[PDB]
Design a binder for this molecule. Structure first.
Ligand SMILES: [Cl-]
Ligand SMILES: [Cl-]
Ligand SMILES: [Cl-]
Ligand SMILES: [Cl-]
Lengths: 126, 126
């Protein structure tokens, strides 16, 4: 049985699950890469030192992030964020860095970016 | 430090990591969904009962699968499969089911499919 996750459980997942899997499109083909994200002010913040990822997402800014907690084949939770790559300007990197780090529970030339949310969905199976 | 994974470690991962994250494209936007796969005869076999996934991949058969083993921010292994959705015909479902199940280590209307490999890459960080 697959049901919709409550907003509370979606929120717990996207506040507390550091690692997400980022999807982007190159030449009409999907690529997935694990990244660590911080949800702050309704967007997800991250960075990459991989110029190929940066370039890909500049040319096609339609991206997603999967967060999931998979216990078994029949016990799992998934949250999909669909949105847009928005690259952080040099002038705004210190803001991005503080948003990323400020009051995080866990312990920790990049190009910083955020993911603005166009659709957020969450489901679970018990 | 990010290096290329050996073929042996790539092989260990794609033989033994049941859960992968599937990427596909709808209307130029990426979607990611966790699925369980079996690598057999150079392709990855799976199935879905979700008609929306099936329909999406029929219209754009360019897909990928990420397998990963993430220990920390700096200790991880990733294998990306880029390939094509190839839907299994009714006549071939029993073959698909046996390939999926036959001599698997672990314990376990669908539409069966396989993912034929066009690029396989694997990297790790220590
Ligand atoms: Cl990252
Ligand atoms: Cl910002
Ligand atoms: Cl599955
Ligand atoms: Cl087949």
């Amino acid at each position: 049985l697959i049901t919709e996750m409550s907003d509370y459980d979606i929120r717990e997942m996207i506040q507390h699950k550091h690692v997400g899997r980022l999807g982007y499109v190159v030449d009409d083909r999907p690529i997935i890469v694990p990244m660590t994200f911080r949800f702050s002010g309704g967007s997800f913040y991250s960075f990459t030192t991989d110029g190929q990822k940066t370039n890909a997402m500049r040319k096609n800014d339609a991206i997603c992030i999967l967060f999931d907690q998979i216990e078994s084949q029949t016990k799992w939770r998934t949250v999909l964020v669909q949105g847009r790559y928005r690259e952080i300007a040099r002038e705004d990197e210190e803001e991005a860095i503080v948003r990323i780090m400020a009051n995080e529970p866990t312990w920790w030339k990049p190009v910083f970016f955020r993911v603005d949310i166009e659709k957020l969905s969450g489901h679970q199976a018990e």
